[PDB]
DNA sequence: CCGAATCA
DNA sequence: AGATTCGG
């Protein structure tokens, strides 16, 4: 009593693969060299509309009826049982014009686009007329880059890691390792976070210290459905730690946003499970201060330092005229160009995500205490026989030093008085009892192994 | 089994682009020289009616029939296909009859109007007949604004500040800068806000206090929707912040009413990015007091004085018949010029708006410790030699001034009584202890420098 | 496909225009001698059918067709395009039969009603023969109010404002100056809401203190838009201020409630432009104490004293039969001919408003202040000369008296112990710190002056 | 492309008046001798259903079909535009078999009770029979409603009152007056409150100290609908004023209580304007205290002290197996017939409300 | 293939 | 002069 080309038309609109059923239940269409995706509103019939022209004109006269279209477009959502995933490759960057690649260098467009599902993109059309090396705004932008990060040896670790991060703000894959802009006011943290922006587009974000000082997995939350399927996101505006009023970085927070699926309740929606595969940035003034501490949290933290100051390692001018320069997208396709050649010279072939902890003193503290204080076992009970005369007594099969003893030794590596509350925190944080008053901490100095 | 002709008429109404797919997804219309658009009701449907007289004879009539003409609406929900974003000008102001462009004066209407894509209008038709310079309405409203704002030069730099920001009122971008109305009851501020409103139509907004001292960002806001796509924006009502029962603008509200795009979420709707294109002004009696103050903010903040009572700079008697002539819209057209002279003085090319945080008490009080109280750095560092003997300590490579010298240097420069809660107040969010007692503030006077 | 002359018919019954589609984007029908309306559902097919029989016999059969209705009222909503809105004049009192104007007393209906778009209404018919002056039931009520207000030289100003409210109780316009029924209980305040309500029908409408000391604009509120659209608003039920546990009344509420088109988010709905053209009487027995006082607030509000009791200025006896006789609506037309003969005498040809405040302690307190506390300004600085030896001393360019001075001397024109609540308020709603001490009110007294 | 017979049927259904359309944009229903009405559901197809035997056979054979019912359903939603208002009569008594007058004592079934126009009724069938005086239930109530309150001289202004607020009760108009319940616990005041419910069915509604002592404008408040078109309300625990953390009874909430429309958001619906026909009644154990003191108030309070516990004016004893008759309307219709007796005693022609404030 | 029934 | 089915 219906038309039975109809399904013969889903049939072969199914076979060209133009619309695929996500994981999370959704409806995704290749329409204009882009895999454009509405949940609010099903594309399948513009995805119709759009390859009408594709198919036998018996076929795209009968695809002319909206009655007979939104047929097809329910057969085709019939016929999509498997909810295929998207978004694998994290070397693959889309654009409005299709999909250029980290590796080579080369962007696809059209069929070869189609073979790479992404389901965001940079939010405008490629050029790579613009992508060029060999320009004026190129060398404008590496003078102004080098202006931000010095080119010098004593800097050069710290440019690295920069244009590692920077290349790595790329990445479609999870961040193992969140990164630190530290510096002072207008170091050049806020010029690199705009250049980013108008080079990555759609696929920047940025966010405030809401993420780093409160539990995400709250009811609703629109930062984590914000934060899906990105590619950098910047977390600014970080207050005084040292002062009263200031919350401390939680580190259940950072381990939180360590991983591929990160979870967390959208607005009247059921899409907890958020992909994670944004770069994550901090900029700050000040060096941070975590109400926890430990060996994971300092090797998924790195701290990038801004040593030039723009009116530190130099002192410059400030250009007024670069940022409207930088809105109007100017080096957007230089910073582009520059992103691709950091990846291949570093995350080519593999993504590397290195931690520099060092750079935050309470994280000093605690590597200078991790390499001083390690902790007791039974490979350290033999050591017993040295360590008897030198205050250790073996407590329940464990090298413990009295904690009068511990206070006394810690003031000679670290000032007592300085680390007063690091060295109470730690203390609290780490102490035990062996009765009510020998109070020990199972850690050994190597000094006496 | 349906008719082909219904794609073709499709096709030509999509060539003429009288319908747009919206960034929210949205459908909007080019009817009456105005791009109507209505969420709840798709008035693809009525631009059919309209524009079926600018078609062939056969296709008109086809027209005629409504599940043909439903048929070709959803033809053309799905052609359209790309969600292209509109109203990007800042300097367009729309009308019920087209567009006012804002550098030349001069008004487009139909085709011509239509190239522009202006989701909100002013409210009204556009008469170029009242749009003129010499009339007797413009000359009693430049004498009603000056005795608002007197043409003196002790108020020269406050009125030409009033002047820019009314200019700005026009601006279809983004507020980069807070203007503040201050003064006493009846001013001036409530006649200038209810002149402007008639000027401006459905383009004018006003809201109280909420927004300043409560958070936006906790489920459904109202305010955020209605501010979203607007001109200008009135805070008004403001409480006495010197006394108790009042809360303290959020600078945190401030900087959120900074962007673009403000988040927030409206009723029972998907619209969190809301565009921010208006002049949010504020009306007070009193002078504000912040939660938070820092450089950021008052680069955000300007502050306008209104000198001249109506029975200050200046008092005059109370006009009572001048209301009604405002609700009238006698003054609405000299009004709208007189803003286009403005606009054309101040903002031509460029769009400019620049910070007066002097003109309040907590703000000049920051301005003025900022100007006498320089962050220490490593670049200060060399400055010890001559700092050692002033009481300033070096810790952690730091210059640091004890808290008791602080004190007792501040009280110089300023009232220790008037400033007692100020003074605490920042150090309390700017001090740092060395151990316990040395208690500094990571800042250097110049007087030592 | 369908039928051609369905839109013949549907442009036929647009050319009537008995359905207009309103500036909120509602559509209203013309049954009946009146303008029903309702958005739950759509009248349009009511009034195709009503209508029908104003049509040629080969239209009408057409219209008998449930579809062809349909078909008919969706032409009727394409076609209908320009959002025109409705209830402009103020002058104009809608019925069930039609529209009595207020300026000749003359009743219109039919096509002539057509001619005025009044989307509420009285509630009920129109009755001329009971819309007369030389009734029993005019003498009663007459007497009734005589006996509510004496006709007394003493209450002739109270009595005339008390009248003057009253026909601005059939104002459609906005209400430019809140009105205070003061008083003790049972003083005929009540009997006239109740007369006026019977009076009026639907278009009264009555609340609480709710608006009156809590903010309107939190999500929706109900009040707002019962309110919205209406003609007369009694706020009864006010608290002993003096007391503890009771709330003031927002100055903030009072302001928002003098727009004419007030905010306030409805339920599940968005019409947060709310019409405001009812009249708001507040029936108090205590007299009101506001949180916020200022020039403008005491502008917006006029008192009326009921002085007589009915078991003063004359005690009489309760009849306890008249309440029954309202509640039937047997003085309903006697009472609107009064109205009318009020609104002849004063509300023609203009509205008129003005404020009595000087019935209120603190606004008392608050006017005299602002009769010997003219505020101080640049024009007042010549008067230095002399005011230097009374203790004026000028300040940054403004005259300044010293605390001291000012409440030794505001002793002797208020009482310090009677308003020293209220002048500690005014003084810490008003004083300034010179340094620390020699704090000041940047107001004058004329007795120096 | 229809049947113009439709529009016919719905013309001739539309004669009969049996559809009607309220004040408040609803429909109503004449089914089974009751105004029946459901807002969730149009009852105008089950009507069209039900009155097609009404009909030529030529009418009833095109009604069976639900489509044609349906579009015959939509001619009559076209056709009904005056909002007409209903219930208008505080006199008349709705039943499930019709409407009892209070004035007279006649019953009306049928099209005599379709003139009368009530959205609620008393949610059962009336019966006559059972509506007698002669009857062993009215001798036996009769003499627990003077145990409740004695026939003696020092409480026959008491005992009048008490009755007078018993037969208003059954009043369709507004209370200009609230009523008390004084004394303490198990006086009787719950014995009546349960024969009064027993007798009126669906028209009782009962609440606590929520509407008394807070604010009843306030966004949502479902005790407000619940109390809209009631015949009386009852408003019991009240808690001890004299102790701390009590609330005081409310003046502002006592006037609001008092007007034939008593405003009130319903939950996500538009039924603020609830009509109050209701006899507030008021049930405590304490001496009631009031935030505010004034005349009206004085003028809208009538107390009502009940002198004989149950184990005071007299002490008897308690009957445990009443409470079974109660809950078995054994005395609902000898109740039905002792209001009928009152309301023709005291509000025949004129509805009275008196104040008594001495109390 | 035309008409009627069934009809968005 | 819904389309589509069923009947002629």
Chains 1, 2, 3 share one sequence.
Not at 83 to 103: A, M
Not at 328 to 335: I, P
Not at 376 to 397: A, F, Q, R, W
Request: glycine share 4%.
């Amino acid at each position: 009593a219906m038309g039975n080309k109809l399904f013969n038309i889903a049939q072969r609109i199914l076979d060209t693969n133009s619309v695929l059923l996500t994981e999370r239940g959704d409806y995704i269409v290749w329409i204009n060299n882009s895999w454009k995706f509405n949940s609010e509103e099903p594309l399948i019939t513009k995805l119709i509309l759009s390859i009408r022209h594709q198919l036998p004109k018996e076929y795209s006269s009968e695809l002319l009826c909206p009655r007979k279209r939104k047929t097809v477009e329910a057969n085709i959502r019939d016929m999509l049982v498997d909810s295929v995933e998207t978004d694998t490759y994290p070397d693959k960057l889309p654009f409005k014009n299709g999909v250029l690649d980290l590796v080579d260098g080369m962007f696809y467009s059209g069929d070869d686009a189609k073979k790479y599902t992404c389901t965001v993109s940079t939010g405008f059309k490629f050029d790579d007329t613009k992508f060029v090396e060999d320009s004026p705004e190129m060398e404008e932008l590496m003078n102004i880059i080098n202006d931000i990060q010095p080119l010098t040896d004593e800097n050069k670790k710290n440019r690295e890691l920069y244009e590692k991060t920077l290349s790595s703000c790329l990445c479609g894959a999870t961040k193992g390792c969140l990164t630190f802009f530290f510096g002072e006011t207008a170091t050049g943290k806020s010029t690199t976070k705009r250049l980013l922006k108008s080079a990555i587009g759609d696929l920047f974000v940025e966010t405030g210290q809401t993420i780093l000082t409160d539990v995400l997995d709250k009811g609703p939350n629109p930062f984590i459905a914000n934060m899906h399927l990105k590619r950098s996101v910047f977390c600014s505006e970080l207050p005084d730690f040292a002062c009263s009023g200031s919350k401390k970085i939680r580190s259940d927070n950072i381990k939180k946003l360590t991983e591929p699926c990160v979870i967390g309740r959208p607005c009247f929606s059921n899409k907890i499970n958020n992909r994670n595969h944004a770069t994550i940035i901090i900029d700050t003034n000040y060096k941070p201060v975590f109400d926890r501490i430990d060996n994971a949290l300092m090797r998924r933290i790195a701290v990038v330092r801004f040593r030039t100051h723009f009116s530190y390692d130099k002192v410059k001018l400030l250009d007024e005229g670069l940022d409207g320069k930088i809105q109007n997208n100017r080096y957007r396709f230089a910073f582009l160009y520059l992103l691709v050649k950091w990846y291949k010279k570093y995350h080519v072939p593999i993504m590397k995500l290195y931690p520099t902890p060092e750079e935050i003193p309470d994280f000093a503290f605690y590597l200078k205490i991790g390499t001083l204080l390690v902790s007791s076992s039974v490979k350290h009970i033999p050591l017993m026989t040295d360590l008897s005369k030198k205050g250790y007594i073996l407590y329940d099969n464990v090298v413990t030093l009295p904690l009068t003893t511990f206070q006394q030794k810690i003031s000679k590596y670290f000032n007592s008085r300085l680390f007063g509350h690091d060295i109470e925190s730690f203390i609290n944080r780490h102490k035990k009892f062996a009765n009510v008053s020998d109070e020990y901490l199972q850690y050994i100095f190597i000094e006496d192994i």
